């Protein structure tokens, strides 16, 4: 680890600086270094970790989609053979994406999840595990594709079970988990009806619990509720 000589607190400070500078690869490297110090992460620190890698992998996914689209068109009837370059470069980006996903999954497995006992930490990490298996699933085509999908499903399901037992229905982690598990159903598991049911039930149960919240908690919860509605509108 090239961050092994830097203080944990300095890594966290520099992750925040990297965020301000929109240097998300640096942010992710700093937060990986912080995780590798071996201490549990606070709430703020968990969100720095997730923000960093979500931005990095989000850019990779967008690039992969562009290249996959070009590749599929190069393979339509009538196309002019362009050689191996489009496939090669899509493969390059894909391998880099898989590497980022494997890095995050490795941090969760060594040893963030096993030390996470509070619902807010454990659900957050299991959601991340489902998310990064989902990104692996998006590019998977081989003998392992079904197992990658089931790994995402299993992580999301454990997170869901804990969240329903231990968090209120407006908890933003619970809401974001359900949002993403619903997208997993729609886009990965070929289960649009499950996706729609989950989004609707999550939205309605949250609606009924909003009366318990402060103004600031209300803003946080209704933001994610709007994303659930947005997806439902896309899908119906």
């Amino acid at each position: 680890g090239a961050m092994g000589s830097m203080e944990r607190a300095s890594l966290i400070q520099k992750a925040k600086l990297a965020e301000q500078a929109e240097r998300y690869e640096d942010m992710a490297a700093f937060m990986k270094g912080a995780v590798e110090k071996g201490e549990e992460l606070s709430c703020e620190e968990r969100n720095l970790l997730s923000v960093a890698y979500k931005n990095v992998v989000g850019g990779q996914r967008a690039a992969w989609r562009v290249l996959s689209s070009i590749e599929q068109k190069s393979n339509e009837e009538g196309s002019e053979e362009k050689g191996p370059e489009v496939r090669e470069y899509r493969e390059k980006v894909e391998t880099e994406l898989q590497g980022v996903c494997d890095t995050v999954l490795g941090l969760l497995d060594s040893h963030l999840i096993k030390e996470a006992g509070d619902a807010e930490s454990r659900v957050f990490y299991l959601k991340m595990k489902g998310d990064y298996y989902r990104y692996l699933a998006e590019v998977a085509t081989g003998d392992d594709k079904k197992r990658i999908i089931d790994s995402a499903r299993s992580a999301y399901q454990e997170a869901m079970d804990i969240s329903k037992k231990e968090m209120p229905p407006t908890n933003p982690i619970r809401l974001g988990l359900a949002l993403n598990f619903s997208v997993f159903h729609y886009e990965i598991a070929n289960s649009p009806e499950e996706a729609i049911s989950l989004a609707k039930t999550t939205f309605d149960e949250a609606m009924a619990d909003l009366h318990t919240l402060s103004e600031d908690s209300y803003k946080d919860s209704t933001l994610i509720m709007q994303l659930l509605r947005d997806n439902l509108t896309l899908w119906t």
Binding site: D131, G176, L179, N180, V183, Y186, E187, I224, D230, N231
Partner: peptide
């Protein structure tokens, strides 16, 4: 694409 967080 659908929304995720």
């Amino acid at each position: 694409f659908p929304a995720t967080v």
